[PDB]
Amino acid sequence: NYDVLKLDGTKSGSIELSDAVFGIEPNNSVLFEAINLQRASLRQGTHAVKNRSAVSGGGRKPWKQKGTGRARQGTIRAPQWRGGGIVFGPTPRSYAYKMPKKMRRLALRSALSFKAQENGLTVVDAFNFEAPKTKEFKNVLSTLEQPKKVLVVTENEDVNVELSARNIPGVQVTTAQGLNVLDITNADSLVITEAAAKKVEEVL
Amino acid sequence: PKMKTHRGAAKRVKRTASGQLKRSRAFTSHLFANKSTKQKRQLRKARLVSKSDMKRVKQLLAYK
Amino acid sequence: MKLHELKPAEGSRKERNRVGRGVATGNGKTSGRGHKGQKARSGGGVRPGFEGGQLPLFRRLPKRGFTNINRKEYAIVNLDQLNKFEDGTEVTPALLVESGVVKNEKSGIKILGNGSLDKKLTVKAHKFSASAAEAIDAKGGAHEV
Amino acid sequence: GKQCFVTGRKASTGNRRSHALNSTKRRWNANLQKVRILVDGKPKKVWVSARALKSGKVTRV
RNA sequence: AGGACGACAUUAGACGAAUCAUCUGGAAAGAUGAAUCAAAGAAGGUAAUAAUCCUGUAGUCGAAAAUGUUGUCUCUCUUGAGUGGAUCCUGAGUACGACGGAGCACGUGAAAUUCCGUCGGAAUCUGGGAGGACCAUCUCCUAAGGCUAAAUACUCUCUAGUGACCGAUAGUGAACCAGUACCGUGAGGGAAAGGUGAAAAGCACCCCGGAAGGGGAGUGAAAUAGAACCUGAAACCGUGUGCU
RNA sequence: AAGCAGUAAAUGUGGAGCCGUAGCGAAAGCGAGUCUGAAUAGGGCGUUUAGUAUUUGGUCGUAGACCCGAAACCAGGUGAU
RNA sequence: GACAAUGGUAGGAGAGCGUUCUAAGGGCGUUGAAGCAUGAUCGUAAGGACAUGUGGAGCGCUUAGAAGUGAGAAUGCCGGUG
Ligand SMILES: [Mg+2]
Ligand SMILES: [Mg+2]
Ligand SMILES: [Mg+2]
Ligand SMILES: [Mg+2]
Ligand SMILES: [Mg+2]
Ligand SMILES: [Mg+2]
Ligand SMILES: [Mg+2]
Ligand SMILES: [Mg+2]
Ligand SMILES: [Mg+2]
Ligand SMILES: [Mg+2]
Ligand SMILES: [Mg+2]
Ligand SMILES: [Mg+2]
Ligand SMILES: [Mg+2]
Ligand SMILES: [Mg+2]
Ligand SMILES: [Mg+2]
Ligand SMILES: [Mg+2]
Ligand SMILES: [Mg+2]
Ligand SMILES: [Mg+2]
Numbered sequence: 048n049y050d051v052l053k054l055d056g057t058k059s060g061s062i063e064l065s066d067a068v069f070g071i072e073p074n075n076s077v078l079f080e081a082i083n084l085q086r087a088s089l090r091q092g093t094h095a096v097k098n099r100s101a102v103s104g105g106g107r108k109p110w111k112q113k114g115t116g117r118a119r120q121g122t123i124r125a126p127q128w129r130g131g132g133i134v135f136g137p138t139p140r141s142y143a144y145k146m147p148k149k150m151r152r153l154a155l156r157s158a159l160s161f162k163a164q165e166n167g168l169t170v171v172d173a174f175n176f177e178a179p180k181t182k183e184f185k186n187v188l189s190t191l192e193q194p195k196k197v198l199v200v201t202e203n204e205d206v207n208v209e210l211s212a213r214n215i216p217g218v219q220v221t222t223a224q225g226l227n228v229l230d231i232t233n234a235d236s237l238v239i240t241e242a243a244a245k246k247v248e249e250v251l
Numbered sequence: 252p253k254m255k256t257h258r259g260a261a262k263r264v265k266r267t268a269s270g271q272l273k274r275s276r277a278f279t280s281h282l283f284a285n286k287s288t289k290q291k292r293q294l295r296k297a298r299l300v301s302k303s304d305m306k307r308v309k310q311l312l313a314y315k
Numbered sequence: 316m317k318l319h320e321l322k323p324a325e326g327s328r329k330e331r332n333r334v335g336r337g338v339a340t341g342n343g344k345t346s347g348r349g350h351k352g353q354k355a356r357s358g359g360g361v362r363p364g365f366e367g368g369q370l371p372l373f374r375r376l377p378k379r380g381f382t383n384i385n386r387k388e389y390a391i392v393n394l395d396q397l398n399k400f401e402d403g404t405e406v407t408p409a410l411l412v413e414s415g416v417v418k419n420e421k422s423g424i425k426i427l428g429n430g431s432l433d434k435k436l437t438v439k440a441h442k443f444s445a446s447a448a449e450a451i452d453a454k455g456g457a458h459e460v
Numbered sequence: 461g462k463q464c465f466v467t468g469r470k471a472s473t474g475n476r477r478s479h480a481l482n483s484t485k486r487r488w489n490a491n492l493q494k495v496r497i498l499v500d501g502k503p504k505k506v507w508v509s510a511r512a513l514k515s516g517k518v519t520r521v
Numbered sequence: 522a523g524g525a526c527g528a529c530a531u532u533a534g535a536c537g538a539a540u541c542a543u544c545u546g547g548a549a550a551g552a553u554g555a556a557u558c559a560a561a562g563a564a565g566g567u568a569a570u571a572a573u574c575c576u577g578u579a580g581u582c583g584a585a586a587a588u589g590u591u592g593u594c595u596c597u598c599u600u601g602a603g604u605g606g607a608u609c610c611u612g613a614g615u616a617c618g619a620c621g622g623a624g625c626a627c628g629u630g631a632a633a634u635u636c637c638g639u640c641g642g643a644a645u646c647u648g649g650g651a652g653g654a655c656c657a658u659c660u661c662c663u664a665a666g667g668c669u670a671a672a673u674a675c676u677c678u679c680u681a682g683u684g685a686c687c688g689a690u691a692g693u694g695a696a697c698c699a700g701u702a703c704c705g706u707g708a709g710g711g712a713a714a715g716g717u718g719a720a721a722a723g724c725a726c727c728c729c730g731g732a733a734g735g736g737g738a739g740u741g742a743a744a745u746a747g748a749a750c751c752u753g754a755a756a757c758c759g760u761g762u763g764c765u
Numbered sequence: 766a767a768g769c770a771g772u773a774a775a776u777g778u779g780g781a782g783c784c785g786u787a788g789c790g791a792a793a794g795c796g797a798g799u800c801u802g803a804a805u806a807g808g809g810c811g812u813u814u815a816g817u818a819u820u821u822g823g824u825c826g827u828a829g830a831c832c833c834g835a836a837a838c839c840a841g842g843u844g845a846u
Numbered sequence: 847g848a849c850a851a852u853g854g855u856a857g858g859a860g861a862g863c864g865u866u867c868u869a870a871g872g873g874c875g876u877u878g879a880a881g882c883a884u885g886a887u888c889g890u891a892a893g894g895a896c897a898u899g900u901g902g903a904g905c906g907c908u909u910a911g912a913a914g915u916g917a918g919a920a921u922g923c924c925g926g927u928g
Contacts, residue, residue: 488638
């Protein structure tokens with residue numbers, strides 16, 4: 048049983064959120080794996096070096112094998128040489144990995160449950176914005192007494208709410224579908240619209 | 252890439268329930284005059300690939 | 316959990332071993348390769364199964380058998396698996412797939428006698444074990460091929 | 461640059477195989493024979509394969 | 522093959538919100554205090570680290586001309602279906618075979634299927650081909666004439682961006698007047714080399730000296746920032762000194 | 766899984782496919798048994814539960830595969846100053 | 847508390863140090879960052895501080911993540927200087 052507050056801050060009513068979705072004891076093990084996975088997926092992996100083959104020139108043997116009194120050498124682009132090819136350096140690759148679906152759903156529930164336990168979950172009746180205004184949204188957060196880092200969740204994409212809260216530092220706007228472990232974990236608080244809360248409960 | 256099976260081994264062995272490999276028996280092609288009836292009779296019955304052999308050749312038949 | 320307080324599960328993560336990074340490690344210089352020889356070399360070793368010129372095991376042993384083009388394999392359901400279905404249910408290949416008793420149908424469904432059938436059922440299957448057929452009849456169920 | 465005028469038949473490449481299955485690249489040439497035929501309504505000598513000549517497909521002037 | 526009109530896009534651009542004071546300092550963007558804007562808190566610059574100083578950003582607007590894309594007319598072209606079983610037609614030196622090769626995941630093998638050279642060489646809808654020798658049956662197709670978009674590959678290049686990519690022995694060979702200097706008969710091989718300062722304010726003048734170089738003076742926050750002029754390690758070379 | 770949607774994301778969707786739940790036999794086949802055998806004997810391999818997906822570490826295979834080094838081989842060029 | 851072990855090459859096992867980058871948190875800096883230099887400091891080691899001079903704008907710390915992550919030798923390569 049979570050109270051639903053109007054944007055003014057006065058209680059509109061009470062909503063029930065399922066214990067499974069917002070009440071399960073958080074699994075830190077699964078949650079860690081999800082956070083690591085999401086951070087890996089963000090990596091581009093566009094990092095490259097040139098090996099001895101790749102570096103320009105270096106075809107001919109620098110000097111005759113024996114008689115010179117020098118060390119035996121086969122190319123000027125060998126790794127010990129200056130301007131030589133790099134041995135086993137970075138190569139373009141992906142860092143993205145997958146995990147089982149059931150665990151993905153658990154990680155979301157665990158993050159959401161952590162929010163609810165810390166009193167980081169606030170339910171609002173609705174966000175109604177005719178036009179995008181950052182100052183108005185800033186007031187709403189002040190009336191709601193929300194912290195610096197806040198995650199605002201809407202049932203479906205709201206253009207005005209996203210536009211309004213875009214330029215406020217620490218504030219991120221998401222949809223129920225768009226909810227991810229990083230965003231929920233990063234945010235100090237989560238402000239969820241009544242419609243969004245139900246949708247999240249249905250999905251998870 | 253995908254690892255490749257050893258086709259000759261696959262032709263020569265079969266896997267049991269416990270992960271052992273059943274093997275056919277050598278000295279069973281020809282020259283049966285030089286071999287005793289007891290030898291020939293007992294060489295007919297199959298054996299398992301040895302543990303020492305398995306250590307060396309286990310990766311060759313991973314897919315098998 | 317918090318991003319500043321992230322912690323891996325115990326035993327989940329171990330650091331890799333890096334060779335050729337000093338004596339104190341115990342994997343410096345030779346790097347766990349010992350001294351000299353073919354294997355000490357980079358890309359050095361023998362192909363697996365090679366016994367140094369002694370005839371390999373998979374050459375000394377004879378090949379055996381053949382593969383039948385028309386080999387048929389049936390998905391097997393034991394009597395115990397049939398117990399889940401409520402008594403008087405008509406067990407069919409389609410139902411078994413829906414129930415999840417069979418995932419891959421293969422050539423057909425064959426009922427086998429392992430376990431005990433505790434519920435009377437009408438079973439339809441491509442093949443039945445002799446024991447299976449009797450067990451279905453004992454319960455009063457009818458088996459149909 | 462020698463081919464049948466009628467069929468365009470030309471030499472081909474392949475392998476000469478020993479009993480030991482050693483391979484050496486070889487050529488199969490067309491049975492081209494220089495024959496006077498009517499080209500553009502004027503008698504002309506051109507190389508024509510015997511296969512084409514068979515059955516009097518190519519008139520010989 | 523064309524024409525007319527419209528729309529969209531590309532190739533210049535335009536507008537675009539909001540900060541002052543104090544302290545330290547050479548300088549404020551810093552700190553401190555009080556404000557403001559945000560559909561703009563991307564970024565760069567500015568005498569130190571700036572959402573509100575500048576260039577911008579969000580958003581919005583704009584094309585004389587050229588090009589591309591597209592829509593609608595116009596234009597051009599053009600009959601579409603049945604029923605019948607007598608006759609005719611339905612791709613020949615072709616299919617196919619032998620021999621020698623090759624290609625099929627398939628090394629001539631039991632080798633189907635498909636190509637080439639040589640040589641021989643069909644049938645014709647009661648036809649012909651295939652179903653991995655081959656035959657029968659059955660089933661599926663209809664060779665020996667062509668055309669055909671998309672889904673796919675790649676990137677010399679352009680435009681806009683991105684990086685738990687490099688940061689001057691790295692990253693391109695090449696951050697710099699580099700495929701240069703240099704080397705070679707030639708093909709070809711192939712470097713080294715970034716950093717004054719915020720601003721040039723780049724040392725008027727005086728003194729020693731042929732000059733170089735230096736000592737003052739002055740500029741500057743700094744010249745122990747004075748020109749390959751940020752920092753300035755070690756090797757190595759000196760000068761002096763406590764103990765020996 | 767590819768795909769599809771999504772911000773080069775998480776993720777959602779996608780059950781094709783893969784592995785396991787049954788083995789034994791060359792195979793036909795049979796089945797908690799099967800194969801061998803004339804055998805209902807003996808014996809072999811099985812039965813009397815735990816797997817599967819992702820991922821840290823170790824090792825292996827395929828890739829140059831820990832780094833440096835031949836004499837040589839072949840292909841295409843450039844040379845009779 | 848009691849007592850027992852602890853030389854070590856190839857090699858196996860474990861626990862750590864330090865470097866660069868990233869995320870999050872929390873900090874430092876023209877009242878002087880990093881670098882460098884010096885010292886009579888600290889820890890069982892790898893190593894960590896502190897003060898002073900120089901320097902002149904960036905840089906730690908905690909936790910997790912990722913590596914072009916550690917040099918004394920290769921008749922190693924390049925530069926400098928004997
Ligand atoms: Mg010497
Ligand atoms: Mg390089
Ligand atoms: Mg370790
Ligand atoms: Mg050791
Ligand atoms: Mg050593
Ligand atoms: Mg050695
Ligand atoms: Mg030895
Ligand atoms: Mg050895
Ligand atoms: Mg402005
Ligand atoms: Mg000011
Ligand atoms: Mg032939
Ligand atoms: Mg057939
Ligand atoms: Mg360079
Ligand atoms: Mg430098
Ligand atoms: Mg260079
Ligand atoms: Mg010891
Ligand atoms: Mg070890
Ligand atoms: Mg290194």
